[PDB]
Amino acid sequence: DQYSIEADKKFKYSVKLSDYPTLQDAASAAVDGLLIDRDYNFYGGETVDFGGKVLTIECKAKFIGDGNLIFTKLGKGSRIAGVFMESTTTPWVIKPWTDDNQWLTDAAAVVATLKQSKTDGYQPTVSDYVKFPGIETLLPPNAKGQNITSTLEIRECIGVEVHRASGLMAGFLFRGCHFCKMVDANNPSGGKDGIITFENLSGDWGKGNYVIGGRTSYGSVSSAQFLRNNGGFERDGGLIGFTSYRAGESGVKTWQGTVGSTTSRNYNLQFRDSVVIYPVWDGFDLGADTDMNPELDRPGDYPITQYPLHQLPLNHLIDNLLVRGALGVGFGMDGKGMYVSNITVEDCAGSGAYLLTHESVFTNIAIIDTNTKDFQANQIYISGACRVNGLRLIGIRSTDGQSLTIDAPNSTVSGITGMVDPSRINVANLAEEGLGNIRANSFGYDSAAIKLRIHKLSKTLDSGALYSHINGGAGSGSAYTQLTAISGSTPDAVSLKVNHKDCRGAEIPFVPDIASDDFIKDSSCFLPYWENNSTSLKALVKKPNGELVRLTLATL
Amino acid sequence: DQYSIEADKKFKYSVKLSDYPTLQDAASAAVDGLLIDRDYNFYGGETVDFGGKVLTIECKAKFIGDGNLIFTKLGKGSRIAGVFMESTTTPWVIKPWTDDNQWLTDAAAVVATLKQSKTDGYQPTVSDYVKFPGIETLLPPNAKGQNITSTLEIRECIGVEVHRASGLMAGFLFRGCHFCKMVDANNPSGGKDGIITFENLSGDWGKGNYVIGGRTSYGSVSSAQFLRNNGGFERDGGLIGFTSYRAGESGVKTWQGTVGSTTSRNYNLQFRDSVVIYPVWDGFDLGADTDMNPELDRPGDYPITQYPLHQLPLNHLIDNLLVRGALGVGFGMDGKGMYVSNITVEDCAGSGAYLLTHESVFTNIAIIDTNTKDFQANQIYISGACRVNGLRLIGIRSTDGQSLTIDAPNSTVSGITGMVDPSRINVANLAEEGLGNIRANSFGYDSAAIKLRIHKLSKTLDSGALYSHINGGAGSGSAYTQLTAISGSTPDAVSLKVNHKDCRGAEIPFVPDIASDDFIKDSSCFLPYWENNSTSLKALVKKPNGELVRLTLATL
Amino acid sequence: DQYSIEADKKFKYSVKLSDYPTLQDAASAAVDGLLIDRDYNFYGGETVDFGGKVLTIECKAKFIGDGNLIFTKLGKGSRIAGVFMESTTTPWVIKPWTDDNQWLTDAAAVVATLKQSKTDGYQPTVSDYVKFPGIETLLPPNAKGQNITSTLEIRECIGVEVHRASGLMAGFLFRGCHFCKMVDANNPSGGKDGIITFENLSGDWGKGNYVIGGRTSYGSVSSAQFLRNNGGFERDGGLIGFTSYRAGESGVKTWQGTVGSTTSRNYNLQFRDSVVIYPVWDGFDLGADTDMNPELDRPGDYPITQYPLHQLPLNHLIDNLLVRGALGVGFGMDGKGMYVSNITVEDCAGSGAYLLTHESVFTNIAIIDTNTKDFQANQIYISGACRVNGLRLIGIRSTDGQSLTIDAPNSTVSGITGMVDPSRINVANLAEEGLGNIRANSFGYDSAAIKLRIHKLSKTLDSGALYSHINGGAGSGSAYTQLTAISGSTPDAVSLKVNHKDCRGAEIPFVPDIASDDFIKDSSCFLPYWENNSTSLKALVKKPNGELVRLTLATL
Ligand SMILES: [Ca+2]
């Protein structure tokens, strides 16, 4: 009895699942620690009440079950580490990529990949019917409408963190939670539902909910997703330092539109320092309104009368994101008044950026080899009146057809770099207002060029140019300078030259027949023209006083 | 007695505060673990001696008290997790922002926000008297000079880490510590003092001290701050992966000048991969010398005779920082020989960057919609002789008045992008030395332009241009090229044209009266001029031998 | 007996090394936790069998020994925290940098730094003989061929994480492991071998192996290195969020060539969000093939017949890296089909980038003050046919000699910024295809310039220019525009002017003697020329029909 007093004071309290027949029995006994030291088969909907206790739950075995294992009434500060969820069912999965990591787009080829596995692919859903046209008819019935996920559901808790979670056909759901985090996810392999979900459709708007660190793979739908969360002006929530691989839908998704009877939208969240690779749909989908066939209202949210479709003041903090390998769109969003910075998107089959934004600013964007399968009309689309300050376009891929590279018809852009085809740029205004003294350095040509193109006149032909051309060969120390203008849709049709053939003179073009009065523009100027009937040059002169006179300029 | 032997060997040692009347009694009993499992009211200055033991302190309740709870004599490798500090006093706080997140600047409006709360605002300090002019007179006495903070003080320890700390009116102070870290701060809400402080005014210069991860909110002064730390050439200290929200002063601060009798300055620290949002003063304040009314000496530091004011070899490693929403300056520093990269600052009421630097290099800087309240003279200021390589300016905001955008009178700059008003650029030298072949693409105009502006001549008017203008309408296949020069402060006053009205000729300007001898510049050139008394063009000719002759060029 | 039942259920299981004579005895007794609470002297090769148990190993003391302490048969999910390795031997180390952090390059100066210490320098190896020419002869024998490292070796384990490791002369080796991580390394000071190594020369290719977070210092060779790892298309492995300081070789290394009888190469790894400072050799060395004296084959890898040397499809995910202070190369790699983004390299004595790549894309690269000791031929080298989209060159350093800045003879580049000497650019093609309307703003000169340079003609002289020059002084409201061409290797030798001396006319250069027929280029143009024998200007006219006629243009 003496020792027991001492022992109760000097040892750390932990209960372990191997000592109990059910998880509730263990939860009930727990005071400080709880060790999961044996695999536990749960039934879908099995619910554990943790009594408001602040528990440190250390997992060293699996939770095995189809459906949801529901944790409730955990005290603020509770932590669950090392959790591993696994389904009982091994479903049919598709694997729409080759052994050289090329995407498969042909429905029949995708069907041929079918296998029963808990990983290395995903269970088809209805969105696959759109993504792979014709697949709905070709999929066997046993591969359609599957619904396998083993989900850890944290329900109506505050201040709970799940650390280093993993699994097979695994999901993690925080339902009606606040100040909860999914930290350092240890590459769970996903199932039918989203891998990591913060859903706050009921109760107060979600706040304080983050994905921090870690990564996921596979899954039928999006890797990380938010419904009805608002981080406040403090931006207390979102996703930082995360990697998503091969989402069956999108890497990171803020939901759009109405779900159930209320809004699924999100405000004031962080999306930073993260990477999405090889999503079947999109890298980041940060829109809040439905694009195609939209609702006429926003129950639970701002009405259309206050903010039109795609013009919500979403106010997310969006910075330093990387997307590679999307089969859909690399980076998509909507909203009004947005600031977005430092986005890098490479090698996507659909548009690199699809931006249904207005009065927003995009700084230091790089869109490098996207729309490679011509799925969309362009590589970067912007609908509304926005500003782009720094835009890198084109890597090493060519474009065979007529699609635009940037179509941002209401936007003002500066700072494009890359080997863009200028005919594939469409913006409201493009300008470099603040360059210093300039040099055009030409490699691999016998000339250097400074060209001008007026898109209203022609998007495909330069309207004038300033050239420098070698006279003779390399090392001659001689070039000629040429000032040109387009005529009859023939670039460089008319030109003045300086030093052609090292002659040290200006070659001046003249009107090839009698110049009309209106040909001359300015006072105190002359326009030479040809009088064939005398073999003479004449000059149409607009005198300093504005009156016209015709003079003889050169004679036989 | 048999079991007790076995039990002492097989169980983890931890003591818990619920078994002791004081925190010292628990600390004294501890061997391995210490669990804080009941709220503990401490008195200011209460000091716990941990006996040099390497303890793992796990907090699941609050430390409650105004003033400092002082931890001493923790062994290297000790860890304190989940600590939650809370004041006993609920002070008066101000909230100088609206329900639409607009800053309040009017003192009377700020006073009207007063409430008693431990969060959602901050206790006024003397710096508020400057920030909100007139507020000193308008604040009620009960809202002035408050001093509420509940501070965990780690004193004279080596190798101690505080993880996942939080609180209300909370602070964390490492005094005279080395190799200590504040890791994954769980959004403590601050009090009167700095939220996270590494202060090494006594003893050896601080080294090995970091803030890694996490975030803070509110507080009256700066969120994270350093005094008398030097990371060594190894750069072993600083701040990485951190977020500061709504600092009452600045997000991240390295102190300047003398504090007490010695230097508060800092060297060789990292500031990387971090974000500061909505500080009342500055985002990052990385200066070491006092700007306004400076000391004539640096006791404990390099003398002015060795390094002039603002020219210390601070040698911080500064990269990948984001600031949004400052009411003061987004990014400020001083020093000589600095390299700074990848800084992004958006939507600040004062200057985006205030750089009292010399012989320093700034690479890939973006300053986007700053000085929005005209608090400073410019958006980015640089005092000394520096280099800027890549500078994005202007988002979507206009500027109504005469303030400069960049004033860097001793600096050489290249790579500006954005819709900057060129009259608002002031630098020593601006150049694009290494561009390739160029094309100017014009949208929304009937012409394209390549303009030249000599700032010594005029900062507001272009001095010459190369234009291409549509002849007729869209699709004509015809344009004219125009080479212009300014005269009488009228841009484009004098010009030569090629292909005006699709005439296929050059329109050449001539001197409107008798040309003086000195009007012609080069040998083997001619200058046409008007002789009104005969209705003739003449030519002032400088012959190949340099001598002048006047010839008749065109006659009736 | 009643209490013992209760106690066995309610307390956390942990054994502690203080209760056992050997580490194996403790490992054998362990069930859940294992506490290292006394220093433990191990013998090189001492091997601990952990029985497949999933153990949480908490270290609060040192493992002391030269050689390897080998951990085997740890269960998936095992974690080792706070480990501290220390050698028994204090070796001789060199410190090739000064008290102002300047690199020492002179062998005799390096030898003079010799001291016996476990840190603050490194043990020489054979690579130092190359790095510091002559040092092999000058080093005393007792400083050559040393081999001191205290290494924690995790052998043939899956799912083991080492967290917050540190030490003196310390190394960490994961041999034949999968799904293992080195997390938040707490600045171990290195020994003779690599600090952190994932080596998978035997068994399956390594996968799931990461360095996440943390930092290292010193060491004789590379800080973090990989052999025979392949992350799969999922990119499940690599290095994220890491800092390396003063590697004796390189910060981060993927091995090249054959080691033993098989490939040491690596595929599909992440290298992101990391920093390397002051390596003696390279920052990042991400090559897979041997550059100098290469193997004729790749046992265990793709044959040369399939992929030529330096053209392996390495497919690493490489983004957001910073290198400063290398004595060798900042960033090096090889491979074909690579995408690389957001690399920043500053202040390196050798090349900033050495890129033996083909059909690869580099986006937003900044190479700022590199090759400062002229160790290589250039600041950035690219061998193969690649694309660079955004390249910042030049900080504040000058270059005295003739070395190139970029030599990328097969690459197409766009978006250079900085005060580059254009004669030091060599590329296949350089272009800005997508600029908007342009303005050249000139500061500190009486003129503004838009220059053209044809590198085939001359890399050192501009071939033509468009200038604007002040007439009179500041505020005159007058400038002249000038269009020039090079002749006899004299820039600006021949020119046309508009508004010289505010004359409002064009000054036109003429051929200084009788123009040859071939001097005129285009039909409907004239070329003025001088007839000295009559003091007349003539015109060589190519009529609209293409035939030549000579006319009198101006007469006495
Ligand atoms: Ca004549």
Side-chain angles (χ1 to χ4, degrees), chain A residues 3 8 10 12 32 56 234 339 389 436-437 441 451 456 462-463 484 487 519 521-522 524 526 552, chain B residues 8 16 58 60 186 215 369 417 432 435 438-440 446 468 477 481 497 500 502 507-508 510 555:
Chain A
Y3 180 71
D8 284 356
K10 78 188 182 177
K12 180 72 161 174
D32 177 4
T56 305
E234 58 265 38
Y339 283 79
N389 188 340
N437 290 308
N441 292 275
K451 294 187 177 177
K456 174 177 175 174
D462 297 312
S463 59
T484 79
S487 181
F519 281 3
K521 189 186 179 197
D522 294 313
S524 204
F526 76 93
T552 300
Chain B
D8 284 356
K16 58 198 176 298
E58 176 164 11
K60 297 190 175 185
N186 188 28
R215 63 172 288 150
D369 293 337
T417 62
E432 322 312 311
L435 300 186
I438 287 165
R439 175 183 293 95
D446 291 351
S468 177
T481 295
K497 296 114 280 197
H500 178 252
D502 204 48
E507 172 176 327
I508 304 178
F510 60 82
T555 62

Side-chain angles (χ1 to χ4, degrees), chain A residues 8 60 369 417 446 481 502, chain C residues 3 32 339 389 456 484 487:
Chain A
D8 284 356
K60 297 190 175 185
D369 293 337
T417 62
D446 291 351
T481 295
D502 204 48
Chain C
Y3 180 71
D32 177 4
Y339 283 79
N389 188 340
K456 174 177 175 174
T484 79
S487 181

Side-chain angles (χ1 to χ4, degrees), chain A residues 12 23 112 156 197 363 384 493 509:
Chain A
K12 180 72 161 174
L23 185 55
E156 292 178 59
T197 303
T363 298

Side-chain angles (χ1 to χ4, degrees), chain A residues 53-92:
Chain A
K53 297 177 287 197
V54 182
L55 296 176
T56 305
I57 304 173
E58 176 164 11
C59 306
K60 297 190 175 185
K62 301 178 180 190
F63 293 132
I64 298 165
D66 293 351
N68 293 36
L69 175 57
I70 306 171
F71 284 9
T72 70
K73 301 183 203 153
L74 284 155
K76 298 177 67 278
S78 295
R79 197 177 203 264
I80 304 160
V83 60
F84 189 103
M85 307 303 299
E86 185 166 341
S87 62
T88 57
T89 298
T90 302
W92 289 92

Side-chain angles (χ1 to χ4, degrees), chain A residues 410-480:
Chain A
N410 297 307
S411 296
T412 291
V413 177
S414 180
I416 295 173
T417 62
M419 301 300 297
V420 60
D421 176 341
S423 74
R424 309 309 174 78
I425 301 177
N426 188 43
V427 299
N429 191 18
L430 192 67
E432 322 312 311
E433 298 286 296
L435 300 186
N437 290 308
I438 287 165
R439 175 183 293 95
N441 292 275
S442 183
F443 296 85
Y445 297 103
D446 291 351
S447 61
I450 300 177
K451 294 187 177 177
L452 299 103
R453 188 174 298 191
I454 310 164
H455 283 251
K456 174 177 175 174
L457 182 62
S458 175
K459 296 188 72 54
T460 55
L461 302 171
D462 297 312
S463 59
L466 171 58
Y467 288 105
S468 177
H469 297 270
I470 291 181
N471 285 315
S476 75
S478 177
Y480 74 98

